[PDB]
Write an enzyme that holds these catalytic residues in place. Structure first.
Site, PDB file in Angstrom:
ATOM      1  CG  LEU A   1      -1.950  -1.094   1.349  1.00 38.64           C
ATOM      2  CD1 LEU A   1      -2.795  -0.911   2.602  1.00 38.64           C
ATOM      3  CD2 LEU A   1      -2.832  -1.148   0.116  1.00 38.64           C
TER       4      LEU A   1
ATOM      5  CB  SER B   1       7.468   1.490   0.928  1.00 38.59           C
ATOM      6  OG  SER B   1       8.220   2.165  -0.065  1.00 38.59           O
TER       7      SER B   1
ATOM      8  CB  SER C   1       7.337  -2.008   3.360  1.00 37.30           C
ATOM      9  OG  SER C   1       8.498  -1.496   2.688  1.00 37.30           O
TER      10      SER C   1
ATOM     11  CE  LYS D   1       4.476   1.020  10.871  1.00 36.37           C
ATOM     12  NZ  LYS D   1       5.947   1.099  11.182  1.00 36.37           N
TER      13      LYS D   1
ATOM     14  CD  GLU E   1      -9.576   0.352  13.133  1.00 41.16           C
ATOM     15  OE1 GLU E   1      -8.858   0.991  13.945  1.00 41.16           O
ATOM     16  OE2 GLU E   1     -10.728   0.724  12.803  1.00 41.16           O
TER      17      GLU E   1
ATOM     18  CG  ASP F   1       4.970  13.301  10.379  1.00 41.14           C
ATOM     19  OD1 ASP F   1       5.029  14.468   9.889  1.00 41.14           O
ATOM     20  OD2 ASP F   1       5.276  12.266   9.735  1.00 41.14           O
TER      21      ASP F   1
HETATM   22  N1  LIG Z   1       0.231   7.926   3.293  1.00 42.76           N
HETATM   23  C1  LIG Z   1       0.734   6.543   3.314  1.00 42.76           C
HETATM   24  C2  LIG Z   1      -0.424   5.603   3.690  1.00 42.76           C
HETATM   25  C3  LIG Z   1      -0.211   4.105   3.234  1.00 42.76           C
HETATM   26  N2  LIG Z   1      -1.317   3.308   3.802  1.00 42.76           N
HETATM   27  C4  LIG Z   1      -1.386   2.989   5.108  1.00 42.76           C
HETATM   28  N3  LIG Z   1      -0.321   3.315   5.893  1.00 42.76           N
HETATM   29  C5  LIG Z   1      -0.442   2.958   7.244  1.00 42.76           C
HETATM   30  C6  LIG Z   1       0.704   3.325   8.142  1.00 42.76           C
HETATM   31  C7  LIG Z   1       1.793   4.000   7.587  1.00 42.76           C
HETATM   32  C8  LIG Z   1       2.871   4.390   8.385  1.00 42.76           C
HETATM   33  C9  LIG Z   1       2.886   4.113   9.750  1.00 42.76           C
HETATM   34  C10 LIG Z   1       1.828   3.451  10.358  1.00 42.76           C
HETATM   35  C11 LIG Z   1       0.730   3.073   9.582  1.00 42.76           C
HETATM   36  O1  LIG Z   1      -0.332   2.452  10.160  1.00 42.76           O
HETATM   37  N4  LIG Z   1      -1.491   2.336   7.825  1.00 42.76           N
HETATM   38  C12 LIG Z   1      -2.553   2.017   6.989  1.00 42.76           C
HETATM   39  C13 LIG Z   1      -3.677   1.363   7.596  1.00 42.76           C
HETATM   40  C14 LIG Z   1      -4.742   1.044   6.803  1.00 42.76           C
HETATM   41  C15 LIG Z   1      -4.744   1.361   5.411  1.00 42.76           C
HETATM   42  C16 LIG Z   1      -3.674   1.986   4.824  1.00 42.76           C
HETATM   43  C17 LIG Z   1      -2.558   2.318   5.612  1.00 42.76           C
END
Ligand SMILES: NCCCNc1nc(-c2ccccc2O)nc2ccccc12
Length: 265
Positions: free
Chosen positions: A10, A12, A17, A33, A81, A127
């Site tokens: 989704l 990185s 990632s 992640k 989630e 952030d």
């Molecule tokens: N702006 C980058 C977002 C990439 N997508 C996503 N990134 C993250 C996520 C990204 C960085 C750190 C913690 C995180 O939970 N969590 C998600 C949870 C559900 C659906 C998508 C997600």
């Protein structure tokens, strides 16, 4: 490995990632992640991000909840989630341009509710920005992600920061010192400008330092005033969360489902 089925990457980046996934036992949608241990800066008791997520993952919230985590020899893996369908606020604004104020009011209000919940749980995000806000498009509900640069909230000065620079306050730029709430309020000012104008107000250090706000889009006086208040150069001149949510621009917010019906359907 056997508990989850892994799907597409989704995203990185500095956070590691993040992949789409399904929990095999009940088909629950998840995000998986991964981050390399060597690429982890801060630790607690595990990565600090795990500590902070557990503190805010109890109860319901505008925060993406941690469901589980695993340690591997060279990495940590977080099970989070995942709403479906979802789109981050950065991609949403990129696709749609500046948001109508009614929409920006509803989103910004939910961001405030989520950040207050973090603070009540003793967590400072550090952030807050469009890329760290997920939109559940069916429910019109916003979720904060990425506590990877956060800290336990405290009342003394922070002398470290690894969040996003263009959302960082002038006192960090000039002095490498800020306090948590007032720095949070500054980034909220940048976020709200971003929502109603379709882009951030400052790109360079000296623009942040100078703190003059130019509006490139038509924005109501009340909204410009709230934005300019959050972006006061003196930290002490910035509004508290309470003052933000009692601001006249913030009155009569739509419910999340109303928001989805009108603006997302
Ligand atoms: N702006 C980058 C977002 C990439 N997508 C996503 N990134 C993250 C996520 C990204 C960085 C750190 C913690 C995180 O939970 N969590 C998600 C949870 C559900 C659906 C998508 C997600």
């Amino acid at each position: 490995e056997s508990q989850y089925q892994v799907g597409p990457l989704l995203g990185s980046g500095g956070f590691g990632s993040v992949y789409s996934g399904i929990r095999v036992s009940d088909n629950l949608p998840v995000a998986i992640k991964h981050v390399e241990k060597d690429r982890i800066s801060d630790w607690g008791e595990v990565p600090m991000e795990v500590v902070l997520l557990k503190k805010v993952s109890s109860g319901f919230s505008g925060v993406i909840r941690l469901l589980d985590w695993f340690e591997r020899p060279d990495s940590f893996v977080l099970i989070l989630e995942r709403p479906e369908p979802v789109q981050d606020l950065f991609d949403f604004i990129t696709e749609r341009g500046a948001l109508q104020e009614e929409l920006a009011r509803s989103f910004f209000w939910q961001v405030l509710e989520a950040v207050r919940h973090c603070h009540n749980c003793g967590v400072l995000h550090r952030d807050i920005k469009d890329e760290n806000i997920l939109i559940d498009l069916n429910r019109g509900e916003l979720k904060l992600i990425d506590f990877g640069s956060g800290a336990l909230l405290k009342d003394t000065v922070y002398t470290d920061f690894d969040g996003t620079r263009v959302y960082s306050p002038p006192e960090w730029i000039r002095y490498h010192r800020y306090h948590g709430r007032s720095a949070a309020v500054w980034s909220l000012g940048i976020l709200l400008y971003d929502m109603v104008c379709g882009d951030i107000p400052f790109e360079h250090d000296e623009e942040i330092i100078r703190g003059q706000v130019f509006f490139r889009q038509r924005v109501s006086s009340e909204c410009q005033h709230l934005i300019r208040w959050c972006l006061a150069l003196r930290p002490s001149d910035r509004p508290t969360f309470e003052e933000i949510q009692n601001h006249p621009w913030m009155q009569d917010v739509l419910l999340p489902q109303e928001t989805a019906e009108i603006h997302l359907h």
